Write a protein that binds this DNA or RNA. Structure first.
Lengths: 213, 165, 141, 68, 208, 125
RNA sequence: GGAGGGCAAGUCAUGGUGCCAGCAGCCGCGGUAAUUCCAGCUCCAAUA
RNA sequence: GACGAUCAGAUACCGUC
RNA sequence: CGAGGAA
RNA sequence: GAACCUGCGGCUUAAUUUGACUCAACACGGG
RNA sequence: GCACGCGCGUUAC
RNA sequence: GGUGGUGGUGCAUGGCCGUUC
RNA sequence: CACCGCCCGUCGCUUGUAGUAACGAAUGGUCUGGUGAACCUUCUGGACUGCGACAGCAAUGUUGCGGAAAAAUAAGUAAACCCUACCAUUUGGAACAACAAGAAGUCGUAA
RNA sequence: GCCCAGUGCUCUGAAUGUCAAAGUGAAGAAAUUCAACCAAGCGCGGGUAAACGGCGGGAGUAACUAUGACUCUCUUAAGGUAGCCAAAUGCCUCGUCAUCUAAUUAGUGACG
RNA sequence: GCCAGUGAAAUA
RNA sequence: UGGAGAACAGAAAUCUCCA
RNA sequence: GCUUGUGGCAGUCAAGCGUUCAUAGCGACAUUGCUUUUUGAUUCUUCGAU
RNA sequence: CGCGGGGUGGAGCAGCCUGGUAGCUCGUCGGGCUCAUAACCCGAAGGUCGUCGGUUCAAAUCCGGCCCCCGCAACCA
RNA sequence: CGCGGGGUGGAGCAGCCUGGUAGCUCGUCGGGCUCAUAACCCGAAGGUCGUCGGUUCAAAUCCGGCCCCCGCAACCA
């Protein structure tokens, strides 16, 4: 709870383990949070790294599609399909628009809708996990998929999600919790007023918990 | 002499609608496709009775071509008016120019040629001199060449062989 | 007994009673109250007068008609009189300002069923019986 | 109105009266004739219930002769 | 009206009250020639004219009355063929009246009269010889009307009339107007034509 | 630059052909609608022939001063014949005679088709 | 002086009039076929 | 008299005072 | 005209 | 309620023949 | 005869 | 002075028919 | 002519009417306080005149007596007139108002 | 007589908005500057005119004619009620008709 | 579940 | 501004040529 | 207090009224004036008494 | 005179601010309806929009200038 | 200007705090019902939700920024 105990989630919580000495292999810590919890559309992000610094952790197939040319916008990589003859029948509704825009990351496709997005395609998907975000959709979905694959930084969109990092095993305290904060930027604060907008969260590394608030 | 002279200026084609659309929105198309060039509309500087109570805008189309599509003007010269225009009888100058009335008709209608109906039966004369004083840079008064259309620009709508003399 | 008293000594009573209960008669109450003298003729049977103008009056209830009437001025009395000119052409003889002799119509009071407020008949023009002027072979001036 | 005075009489066609063929006896004579034409024994003779109207002879020339 | 006190003088330059004084109570004499118009310019010659000798304002209505009684006789003993009474004054200067109960007031127009310069010609007419006294006696009338005034003068010209110019027009027997230069003779002067003249014509232009 | 149906002249030769007998030679027959063909092929009247000639005189005698002598008729049942073009025939309708200038187009059509028989309705109340 | 009733006397298929002119003592007549108006005819009543 | 309601209208037939 | 208001 | 049909009113018209008007007028005058 | 207002009906969604 | 009249009075009328049924 | 029947009032309209009371005037009559013609009577008055005696025979004159005209007088009958009250009989008066009668006026509906 | 909307007065009233000083919280190193709540009062609600005072205006609108108890209206609390006048209030006004005069810009009696 | 997912927005 | 070409424009509302 | 427009009052000319005639009696138009109990301008005299 | 409102059948009222059509009631005149009589109803005749001009394709309609009507305002010598 | 409440048919009122449907009354317009006449009833035409944008699939509806409306508050030199 943004208090002294931050370094109790960090410093005092960095060698908890669950057995004997402390092992003999590398470490793996971070600092959990989110993306903005807005609705993955209107306003929740912009630009600027923390860091932070990471990438996947497990899988990365997100979202990118629109026309017959959006497939190759997911061929030399791996993404979801919006289909062509579906935006007039079933390419969006609940578990539909989901499918294409409901993965884990967010979305990195382009744009093309017309008079249909106030309760179907572009619509039903927003806070679900996608609704047309900033993925430099013009050359494709790879270069700006540096904001959708690796490096990172920590593009935090769709539904929660983000990253963190600072050191290895044991050598951080005030800058461990203050490294977790450092592992937060346009995700912990931003422009006009943004020093906080949530309730709680989690964190650790592999040991056991962090802040007991 | 007698070294150079005679040519067909431009084919000043113009209909005079008198509304907005989808009416002028037509005299356009019509013009445009009888044209190949596009359609320079016409203003409407100001108001009175018979409608046309609008500020300078929407009430006719201008598109007017020239040169190679020369004959493209007399492409109904002879035709449209049986190669006969304001004839008789004094000073052989029979109203250097040719009467007209509005044109148009076409939502279905069929191509032309004549048809399209009467139209802007002019785009005509006024004697001679030189070539580009309508120039740019070092501009100027044409020469002192030729006859006020008439005794000149008549004897060259007289060798498109037709009636007016 | 009945209301009336039957005493040989009570004649007076019965007498005064009759003199009293008798006022309930209009015919009585009428002549008794010198009423006849106050009418336009002053009791008289007939009256002379000057024609003030020939006016016409409308019939009443089920009848609709233009009655011929002369407004007369009685001589010594000097009253405005409504006088019905009898038979057909009659009014054609009455010239305005002539002298006329008038009499009532059936008992001085109600006018003939038809007429409205007219109580008199015209019998003479310039002292010439109307009937006389009504029949050619008689008289005319 | 007024000028509408005696409209009727003026409009009536003056018919003339049948200039007495002979005369009408005035005196005991008239009362006599009447006595004869009605109360004379030949009329009091036929039923008193079936004797004619002293003017059914409305002057009808057709029934005037049938009786006489 | 308001008498002739707003009468003959100056007291005010000349408020011709056009563009600047809008409300000129309209004129009074919208006549001017009233007579045997469309005249011959021969025919009704020898004109007698009525000159006023006194820098005054021959009022509005006044000029009217002039016309009135002018024509009255003009005709009444000589005919519609006899007159032609050229107005020849004419009535500008809109005069005004007056009416914070005495504090700075300019005039509101109040009738238009005209400035008879002492010597100027007023309501002056023109007619044939046999009309002399006719005309003359008549114009007398006016002089008696109209804040007089008076020339009742007999004339000549120029040629607004007969009019001496007598020996003149009686000399321009041959012609009418130009004359003028010497060139495009489209005033049929007689008689050949062009050829001859155009000979002599340059025949002198050449002598230079 | 306007022309006419089937050639105004071909018909004058078609109608007044070798056998210019019955007003409507079997030639003109091929041209008319079934209803008209019906009539002529059935029993057309002779009066319709003397009326014909009445227009004839009106068309020539009149100077080029384009002033035709109106021919009057009740034969509203007549079907305009080729040679009937150009003349102004007065046709009765109910009240008076109607003058109509016969154009090339009104042929094969009933002469009555132009003599308005009733004035349609204007309105107000 | 009357002839629908009271009140004696027309059941005229009479003419004119058309709620007008007018009648009517009181009932009531009259708005195109009036038994009461105007008039003819014939009737009744009292009869110098 | 003051109010509610009812009525096209209700200072009336009901209702609160 | 997509089964039709007060009636 | 819909489009036609037919009758009545209305308004037009040279003229739109006229009867009939709550069941006891209006596809009724055999219309 | 047609700006329309009624009344039997014919065909149908 | 007649004929004839899809001309007027159904409140002058026959005949017939509707309604009360 | 039978509830699409009867029917009431406000206001209006149409055609009309001058009542009862008061007041005004007219005629007549009475009361109150005065002015008061005329005449009966009264007390006067006494021209004129009759008688007797004396101045003369006589006209005339003095006086006594008697009758007696005008005048004047008081009380009285009391005409007319005025004033103060009251009665009777007639007759009069107006805009607005009022009353009378009528209706398929107007608004509603009392019975 | 009718008007409580206006101005005043005055009641427990209003579920809520201002609203000062101290008192409280937050922030700086303080000085200090931001906060939240906060009596009355205000504003909201009601009564109140033998309290100050108020008391409309135009259109149509038959049974010669002018006419309004008629309705239509636009309208502010309410739209002058009994009563009363050219009056010591009436502009035009010397109001119009009488009445008192030979005569009345006076009187009085009427009429709105 | 999810790679499928519609919809206004997908969860153990 | 005249003289030219007018189809909802045709006094013109507005369209194109020319002195 | 000037001034006199505006008020008032007289005056010339004679077209007209005055049925016959311009002036007995009056006079359009046009024009000359007097008047200082109207009114209007003006601000000289008097608010350091009217 | 200065402000502001108004003249429309024979009368009293509409139409004008929203240019193209002039309406209502009475009165005058004719007919329905009815067994008939009232009543009641229909249909006609009738306006030049005070008058003069301007915009305008078009004026009762918007705009003016005169002529009277009412209301305000007012200092004449 | 600072606080707080509000603009939705032609008028007066709803729907908004509870996103998907814009309702009522009068007025305008048509029809029922009735033997008929009132009355009474049904059905239509008509709102862009002041205006601009944002969330949103979706906005009169939640959120803003302007434009007027009312209420509080107020110290200008």
């Amino acid at each position: 709870i943004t208090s002294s105990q931050v370094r109790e989630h960090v410093k005092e919580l960095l060698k908890y383990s669950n057995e004997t000495k402390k092992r003999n292999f590398l470490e793996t810590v971070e600092l959990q949070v989110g993306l903005k919890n807005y609705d993955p559309q209107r306003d929740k992000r912009f630009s600027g790294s923390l860091k932070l610094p990471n990438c996947p952790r497990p899988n990365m197939s997100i979202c990118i599609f629109g026309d017959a040319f959006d497939v190759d916008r997911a061929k030399s990589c791996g993404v979801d399909a919006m289909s062509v003859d579906d935006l007039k029948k079933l390419n969006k509704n609940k578990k539909l628009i989901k499918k294409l825009s409901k993965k884990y990351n967010a979305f990195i496709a382009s744009e093309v809708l017309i008079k249909q997005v106030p309760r179907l395609l572009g619509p039903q998907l927003s806070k679900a996990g996608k609704f047309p975000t900033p993925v430099s959709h013009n050359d494709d979905l790879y270069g700006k998929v540096t904001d959708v694959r690796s490096t990172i930084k920590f593009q935090l969109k769709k539904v929660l999600c983000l990253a963190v990092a600072v050191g290895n095993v044991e050598m951080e305290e005030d800058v461990l919790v203050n490294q977790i904060l450092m592992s937060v930027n346009f995700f912990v604060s931003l422009l006009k007023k943004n020093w906080q907008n949530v309730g709680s969260l989690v964190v650790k590394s592999s040991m056991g918990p962090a802040f007991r608030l | 002499n007698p070294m150079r002279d005679l040519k067909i200026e431009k084919l000043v084609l113009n209909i005079s609608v008198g509304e907005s659309g989808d009416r002028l929105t037509r005299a356009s198309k019509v013009l445009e496709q009888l044209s190949g060039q596009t359609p320079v509309q016409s203003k409407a500087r100001y108001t009175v009775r018979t409608f046309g109570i609008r500020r300078n805008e929407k009430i006719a189309v201008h598109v007017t071509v020239r040169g190679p599509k020369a004959e493209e003007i007399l492409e109904r010269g002879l035709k449209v008016k049986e190669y006969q225009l304001r004839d008789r009888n004094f000073s052989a100058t029979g109203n250097f120019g040719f009467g007209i009335d509005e044109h148009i008709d076409l939502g279905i209608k069929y191509d032309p040629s004549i048809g399209i109906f009467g139209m802007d039966f002019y785009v005509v004369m006024n004697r001679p001199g030189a070539r580009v004083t309508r120039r740019k840079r070092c501009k100027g008064t044409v020469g002192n060449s030729h006859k006020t259309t008439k005794e000149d620009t008549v004897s060259w709508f007289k060798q498109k062989y037709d009636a007016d003399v | 007994g009945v209301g009336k008293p039957r005493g040989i000594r009570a004649g007076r009573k019965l007498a005064r009673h009759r003199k009293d209960q008798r006022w309930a008669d209009n015919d009585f109450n009428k002549r008794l109250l010198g009423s006849r003298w106050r009418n336009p003729f002053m009791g008289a049977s007939h009256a002379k007068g000057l024609v003030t103008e020939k006016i016409g009056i409308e019939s009443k209830q089920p009848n609709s008609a233009v009655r011929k009437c002369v407004r007369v001025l009685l001589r010594k009395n000097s009253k405005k009189i409504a006088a019905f000119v009898p038979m057909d052409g009659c009014l054609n003889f009455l010239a305005e300002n002539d002298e006329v002799l008038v009499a009532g119509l059936g008992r001085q009071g109600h006018a003939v069923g038809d007429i409205p407020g007219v109580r008199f008949k015209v019998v003479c023009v310039k002292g010439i019986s109307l009937l006389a002027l009504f029949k050619g072979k008689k008289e005319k001036r | 109105t007024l000028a509408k005075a005696g409209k009727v009489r003026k409009q009536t066609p003056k018919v003339e009266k049948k200039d007495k063929p002979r005369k009408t006896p005035k005196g005991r004579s008239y009362k006599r004739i009447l006595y004869n034409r009605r109360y004379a024994p030949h009329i009091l003779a036929t039923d008193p219930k079936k004797r004619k109207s002293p003017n059914w002879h409305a002057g009808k020339k057709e029934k005037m002769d049938a009786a006489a | 009206r308001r008498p002739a006190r707003c009468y003959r003088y100056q007291k005010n330059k000349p408020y011709p009250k056009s563009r600047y004084n809008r409300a000129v109570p309209d004129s009074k004499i919208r006549i001017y020639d009233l007579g045997k118009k469309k005249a011959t310019v021969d025919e009704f010659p020898l004109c007698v004219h009525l000159v006023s000798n006194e820098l005054e304002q021959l009022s509005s209505e006044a000029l009217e009355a002039a016309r009135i009684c002018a024509n009255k006789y003009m005709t009444t003993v000589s005919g519609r063929d006899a007159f032609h009474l050229r107005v020849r004054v004419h009535p500008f200067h809109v005069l005004r009246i007056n009416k914070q109960g005495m504090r700075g007031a300019w005039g509101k127009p109040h009738g238009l009269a005209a400035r008879v310069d002492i010597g100027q010609i007023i309501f002056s007419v023109r007619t044939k010889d046999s009309n002399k006294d006719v005309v003359v006696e008549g114009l007398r009338r006016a002089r008696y009307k109209f804040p007089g005034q008076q020339k009742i003068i007999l004339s000549k010209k120029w040629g607004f009339t007969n009019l001496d110019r007598p020996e003149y027009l009686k000399k321009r027997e041959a012609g009418e107007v130009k004359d003028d230069g010497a060139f495009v003779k489209f005033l049929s002067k007689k008689g050949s034509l062009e050829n001859n003249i155009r000979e002599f014509p340059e025949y002198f232009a050449a002598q230079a | 630059f306007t022309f006419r149906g089937k050639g105004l002249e071909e018909l004058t030769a078609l109608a007044s052909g070798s056998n210019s007998e019955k007003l409507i030679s079997d030639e003109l027959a091929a041209l008319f609608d079934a209803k008209t063909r019906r009539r002529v092929k059935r029993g057309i009247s002779e009066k319709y022939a003397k009326f014909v000639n009445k227009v004839r005189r009106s068309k020539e005698k009149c100077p080029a001063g384009e002033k035709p002598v109106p021919v009057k008729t009740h034969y509203r049942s007549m079907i305009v014949i080729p040679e009937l073009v150009g003349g102004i025939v007065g046709v009765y309708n109910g009240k008076e005679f109607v003058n109509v200038e016969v154009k090339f187009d009104m042929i094969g059509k009933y002469l009555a088709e132009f003599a308005m028989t009733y004035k349609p309705t204007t309105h107000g109340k």
